[PDB]
Design a protein around this ligand. Structure first.
Ligand SMILES: *C(=O)CCCC[C@@H]1SC[C@@H]2NC(=O)N[C@@H]21
Length: 79
């Protein structure tokens, strides 16, 4: 599976790296998230791609950002 789910479809993803930090940049701006599943979600939902310049677009300490429910959790269904 590699295609973004459609609105109303369950967002089903096997997490392999829950504590990985990613500076993503899309329609809601640039910010840090945690986990590969939330990284996939940010791409499908916000057009947020992993920054090629994370220290410029996020913060110099982006990789040390504490992972929380807010920056890690993925909605169960695609809005
Ligand atoms: C965007 O935020 C709107 C989402 C609407 C989802 C609806 S509200 C009623 C149903 N219950 C639920 O959990 N999701 C459905």
């Amino acid at each position: 599976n590699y295609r973004c789910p459609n609105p109303g479809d369950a967002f089903e993803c096997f997490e392999s790296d829950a504590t990985a930090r990613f500076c993503v940049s899309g329609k809601r701006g640039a910010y840090v998230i945690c986990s590969k599943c939330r990284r996939k979600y940010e791409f499908c939902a916000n057009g947020a791609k992993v920054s090629k310049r994370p220290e410029v677009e996020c913060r110099a300490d982006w990789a040390s950002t504490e992972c929380t429910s807010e920056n890690s959790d993925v909605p169960s269904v695609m809005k």
